[PDB]
């Protein structure tokens, strides 16, 4: 038994790892490369898709599912297991990827073909292929998120996928992994832990209080898959002490996802499940409004506050949020609140730099609006949490993250007495 990395090796995008054991060949995740590496999506998988017996999916994010349609595109026709949640979320996610995609590497034909082979698999359910036994573990990174426990040949392998940030309240706690012979783990935040959730929420409400009372606009760039609605959960549960203001979820995508949430109750925390039981939907705070078209979205640019606005892209790589910033950043009474990680060398980091003005949609705009960075809202397990999850495991191979982060995590693991290595593309590791 051995696992072969085929993405997310000394990098963060591209998750896909071939499991070779018991004459069977299981594909663990199959995501697209993003950012600067985006062209690699056109390159070859590094293995014959046609020779895959089955593929498992940890969660619906593009960086872990994005290259599945390409897998079918080239022949593969086996089953693709995932949680109901991961399945339903994937449809929304992929149809959007198709639509919002400059240079395609797969077609609509490849999409339904892929969606068509998806087969449900829930936490604690065991799959069997030859002597190989597979099952999903609770990851708490998204609804339906999970880590893979592969067991066979007298060995045991644990694949982490993306471990969530246990401190938040929407998803349930990640599960400790079973003691394994080998753990293929992520390290997005191998260098540092996040600011505590609790105090992050507090600082969050603080910002809203001040901004909303002076009739300002609270701008919140956000991803449409889970971050957008988690922010709406906070609003929903602290909305009793917040000044009245319309809440605009300026992202059709984010809405579709929201609509789907009620159908996913089981996948959330006991707290979130308790609300749904009282007949209420904690993802819909008062005055919530989902903006469908550009016309209304642009009117919000020139609409006096107070108002809370949410829009993507979450990395500010484009989207309606730019238009909101282009017209809301020069008023000191408004507040920009980053709730997601901002890549370096981007407008995000650039804005946090705090120059006198910034370029947006071809126009240097004075930066007076106050800026904030609430990292406590990260959906990834921080370094302290990483060390916890990984505790006790004899051997660990690192994926997902930048060399440095992974090395930082590595060093700590090593000094702890654990064996470790950063995965390499192609170079398999013995389970
Ligand atoms: Zn993810």
From Swiss-Prot:
GO molecular function, one term: metal ion binding
Enzyme Commission identifier(s): 3.1.-.-
Entry's localization field: Cytoplasm
Enzyme class: hydrolase
SS bond list: none
Protein name: Ribonuclease TTHA0252
Gene Ontology, cellular component aspect: cytoplasm
InterPro entries assigned: Beta_Casp, MBL, Metallo-B-lactamas, RibonucZ/Hydroxyglut_hydro, RMMBL
UniProt activity-regulation remark: Inhibited by cadmium, cobalt, manganese, magnesium, calcium and nickel ions.
Cofactor note: Binds 2 Zn(2+) ions.
Native source organism of the sequence: Thermus thermophilus (strain ATCC 27634 / DSM 579 / HB8)
Upper lineage: Bacteria, Thermotogati, Deinococcota, Deinococci, Thermales
CDD domains xrefs: TTHA0252-CPSF-like_MBL-fold
